[PDB]
Write a protein that binds this ligand. Structure first.
Ligand code: NAG
Ligand code: NAG
Ligand code: NAG
Lengths: 48, 74, 108, 252, 243, 128, 48, 48
């Protein structure tokens, strides 16, 4: 979702906070969007 | 003079086939388009290639659309 | 390969002119004309560049012009110091920035 | 001469260990059932381009093919990669050697390394100046053409030469037919068994059946109907329409 | 051999040294105050002796004082487009120091040349030594210079009386690359004792995590270093010391 | 302060070769096409060639094309002219010529303009 | 949600438009995501 | 392919010697007492 790598350990060990923060921000925004889609699908499937 | 602008042939294509261990023959259907710019059957659902149009009606195996569908028979 | 007078004579205060003709290919086609002045036992000193432009420091009395294939150096108000040789040149197609017969200006 | 490439031209795309998984990835691979050039060595070694990597296949019985050269001009004017193998030693160089009119073998140096019945498959590619060479040897019993089968190539050589290469050539041992083909950026779905070996591969740039295989991410598609992104017809030309403005400028 | 070298190369013909299988403490690059410029973009300079990469390349050259600011991703200029182009996604660092006392003759050091005329921008990490006469005009230049045909290279005037902007600056750049190959060059990072069957913080070639390492039976190929899962997480690891 | 020192006088035998030195300073040496202009005693001035200390590029007159070899050593910032197969009309005073501008005047016609700093004198007397 | 403060008036009175625009963008993005979650939950509850 | 706001056409007749005096920064009788061209001249001149 715009990050340099999907694993957070590489960003935590390589990049400094001034950019690791925005990388983590992008990663967590993508992950929360995916989790919201997943829980909405699970909710409609549970309703069915 | 007035000239109408129309987006040319574009529409979600699809491909129908039976199971793998049954046969390797496959059919391709260009939907909601007339494949004139591309064993062809032209219906309201577009144009299907690979299958043969048969007038004898049978039970619908894999639904294609517009009351028409395909099967794998001799 | 250019043709200027070998010596021109003038009086003090008078406006004298020294021309030099090249060809239709060197002068008649390029605004790359050159005018030097040299004093005896001295290095040649540029007076006029690009047909009519004066380099920094050159006195205004030296004026440049060109007509077809002949360039012209006009010295208004001749002075005793104006006694020197003048060497015009024109780009010749290759090498390079040479000149005419050289003209000794004498002030009677 | 030309021949077929039914299932050859597969290799390990990376060095990550997998087991019993269907992994799809896009990389430089040989298109299946494509026409590849064929050469003989009876009673023949031209220069072939190196645009986007090369796949080579050698059917040997007495080790005739013994050298390969990569470069641009091949006249000792620029750097060229030379790889040779004399039956007990493998010599790899990148120096600028003086090549004759027809280099062969009779029975500015920045790198130097010194170490039918046999089908040897190789693939050579260049990624950001890194020359990658994969290979795989097998025993076969065929003289006519290339035997049909599936076999992956393990990573063998990776050299950071950084030399621009556009042509290559082979070198025999005079006192041996071989096939050559080109690679394309294709997407392949490979199956890794419990042993981690590539047992099957599907190229969904050939037929819509393999396209549905790439779609469902499985080597077996059930009875049904599916597809992917639509195919759109591209414009043939560009039509510019502007007024015939009558007002002119009175420059006259 | 780079910093303490008696001589360097030109701008376009920069010296490129590839390093493999070595250690670098990087402490000498921090305490030394002689470096006028030290800009690390891809990796933070403080966290350098604890990471690890596959390969590294050092490109050294000598430029003008005004061109020192041209070594940056996305930066444009004469040197940035005709002598040395840096990619936008550059993972490395740049060091630069003034050496006007060394690379400057009493009358001017003209041994350094730089490319100023080229009909196209250079590629990232591209080296061009084309001495062909540049064609500025429409007339063809068949090996003859002059009008509309100028030399593609120009010499530097390095005099001890020039300003700080026109002083010779030695500039080196370190570019790191990390592939699936075993990581070769990084800090010393002395190996700790190996402990099995315990929840601990593991670190392998920069890959840091927390987990329990246990004996395995998966036969990994000699060129397979790391093993990933469906979720792109590491499942098996090869000890960088013993097979 | 552009300073320009030319080598000393020479006497030569005809058909031989003569080499004149030309040491420059006080300016950016390599940034100039420097010419070589001769003049017979009491005659007109005669240009011979020029050189770029940068890239060693040079160009001579067709009259001199073949008999003149012009070189330079930018380290000491010193240009050099040689004329082989000498003869009688070669007896003359020679100079170099440092040019006005810099050829960073991309199309500033450099260096087809001039010689602003001329050299003292070099008298070549080719007499048997 | 990445902003320096949850209150908008303080951001308007303390920051300049060049950064207040980005702050407002982040704030409205977070509020819009929360509103999407809330309206999805409301639609599910209304269907039930 | 570039089209401007306004055009100014200055038309006159000069002598054969003055044909060289029509340029930015020219010196002469015509270039000083009759018609002078600015140094930042953005245009063209056609003489026949
Ligand atoms: C394919 O396999 C299934 C499952 O074993 C079997 O029922 C079916 O008959 C097979 N298809 C054919 C054509 O034999
Ligand atoms: C579709 O194309 C076929 C020719 O392939 C033509 O016969 C038919 O009339 C077309 N139908 C329409 C609706 O244009
Ligand atoms: C995998 O490797 C093991 C180890 O030798 C071997 O016994 C087995 O036959 C191989 N194949 C499978 C499917 O396990």
């Amino acid at each position: 979702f715009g990050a340099i790598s999907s694993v957070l350990n590489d960003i935590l060990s390589r990049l400094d906070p001034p950019e690791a923060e925005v990388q983590i921000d992008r990663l967590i925004t993508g992950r929360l969007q995916s989790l919201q889609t997943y829980v909405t699908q699970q909710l409609i499937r549970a309703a069915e | 003079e007035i000239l109408d602008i129309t987006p040319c042939s574009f529409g979600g294509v699809s491909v129908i086939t039976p199971g793998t261990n049954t046969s390797n023959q496959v059919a391709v259907l260009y939907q909601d388009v007339n494949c004139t710019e591309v064993n062809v059957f032209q219906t309201r659902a577009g144009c299907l290639i690979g299958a043969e149009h048969v007038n004898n009606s049978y039970e619908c195996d894999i639904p294609i659309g517009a009351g028409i569908c395909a099967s794998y028979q001799t | 390969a250019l043709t200027q007078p070998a010596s021109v004579s003038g009086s003090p205060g008078q406006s004298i002119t020294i021309s030099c003709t090249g060809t239709s290919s060197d002068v008649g086609s390029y605004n790359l004309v050159s005018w030097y002045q040299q004093h005896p036992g001295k290095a040649p000193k540029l007076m006029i560049y690009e047909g009519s432009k004066r380099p920094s420091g050159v006195s205004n009395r030296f004026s440049g012009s060109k007509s077809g294939n002949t360039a012209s150096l006009t010295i208004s108000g001749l002075q005793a110091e104006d006694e020197a040789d003048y060497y015009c040149c024109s780009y010749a197609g290759s090498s390079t920035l040479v000149f005419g017969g050289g003209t000794k200006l004498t002030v009677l | 001469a030309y021949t077929n490439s039914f299932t050859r031209g597969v290799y390990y795309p990376d060095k990550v260990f997998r087991s019993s998984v269907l992994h799809s990835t896009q990389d430089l691979f040989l298109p299946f059932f494509s026409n590849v050039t064929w050469f003989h060595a009876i009673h023949d070694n031209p220069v072939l381009p190196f645009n986007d990597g090369v796949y080579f296949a050698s059917t040997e019985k007495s080790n005739i093919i013994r050298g390969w050269i990569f470069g641009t001009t091949l006249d000792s004017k620029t750097q060229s990669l030379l790889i040779v193998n004399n039956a007990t030693n493998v010599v790899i160089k990148v120096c600028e050697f003086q090549f004759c009119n027809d280099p062969f073998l009779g029975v500015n140096c920045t790198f130097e390394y010194v170490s039918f019945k046999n089908l040897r498959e190789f693939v050579f590619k260049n990624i950001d100046g890194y020359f990658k060479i994969y290979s795989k040897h097998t025993p076969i019993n065929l003289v006519r053409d290339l035997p049909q089968g599936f076999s992956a190539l393990e990573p063998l050589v990776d050299l950071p030469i950084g030399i621009n290469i556009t042509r290559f050539q082979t070198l025999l041992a005079l006192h041996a037919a071989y096939y050559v083909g080109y690679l394309q950026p294709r997407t392949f779905l490979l199956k890794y068994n419990e042993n981690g070996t590539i047992t099957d591969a599907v190229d969904c740039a050939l037929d819509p059946l393999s396209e549905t295989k790439c779609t469902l991410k499985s080597f077996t598609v059930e009875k049904g109907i599916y597809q992917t992104s639509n195919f759109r017809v591209q414009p043939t030309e560009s039509i510019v329409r502007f007024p015939n403005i009558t007002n002119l400028c009175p420059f006259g | 051999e780079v910093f303490n070298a008696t001589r360097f190369a030109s701008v376009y013909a920069w010296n490129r040294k590839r390093i493999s299988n070595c250690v670098a403490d990087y402490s000498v690059l921090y305490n030394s105050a002689s470096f006028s410029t030290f800009k690390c973009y891809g990796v933070s300079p403080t966290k350098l002796n604890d990471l690890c990469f596959t390969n590294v390349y050092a490109d050294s050259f000598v430029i003008r004082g005004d061109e020192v600011r041209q070594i940056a991703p996305g930066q444009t200029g004469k040197i940035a487009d005709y002598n040395y182009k840096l990619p936008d996604d550059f993972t490395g660092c740049v060091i630069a120091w003034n050496s006007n006392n060394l690379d400057s003759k009493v009358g001017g050091n003209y041994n350094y040349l730089y490319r100023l005329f080229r009909k196209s921008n250079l590629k990232p990490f591209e080296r061009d030594i084309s001495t062909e006469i540049y064609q500025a005009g429409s007339t063809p230049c068949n090996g003859v210079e002059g009008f509309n045909c100028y030399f593609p290279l120009q010499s530097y005037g390095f005099q001890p009386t020039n300003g700080v902007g026109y002083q010779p600056y030695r500039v080196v750049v370190l570019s790191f690359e990390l592939l699936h190959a075993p990581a070769t060059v990084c800090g010393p990072k002395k190996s700790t004792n190996l402990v099995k069957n315990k929840c601990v913080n593991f670190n392998f070639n920069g890959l840091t995590g927390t987990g329990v390492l246990t004996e395995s039976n998966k036969k990994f190929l000699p060129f397979q270093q790391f093993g990933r899962d469906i979720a792109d997480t590491t499942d098996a690891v090869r000890d960088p010391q013993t097979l | 302060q552009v300073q320009l020192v030319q080598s000393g006088a020479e006497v030569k035998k005809p058909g031989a070769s003569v080499k004149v030195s030309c040491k420059a300073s006080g300016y950016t040496f390599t940034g100039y096409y420097m010419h070589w202009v001769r003049q017979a005693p009491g005659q007109g001035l005669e240009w011979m060639g020029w050189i770029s200390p940068v890239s060693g590029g040079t160009n001579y007159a067709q009259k001199f094309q073949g008999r003149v070899t012009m070189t330079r050593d930018t380290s000491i910032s010193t240009a050099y002219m040689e004329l082989s197969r000498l003869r009688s009309d070669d007896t003359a005073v020679y100079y170099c010529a440092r040019a006005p501008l810099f050829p960073t005047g991309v199309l500033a016609g450099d260096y087809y303009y001039y010689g602003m700093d001329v050299w003292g004198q070099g008298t070549t007397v080719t007499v048997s």
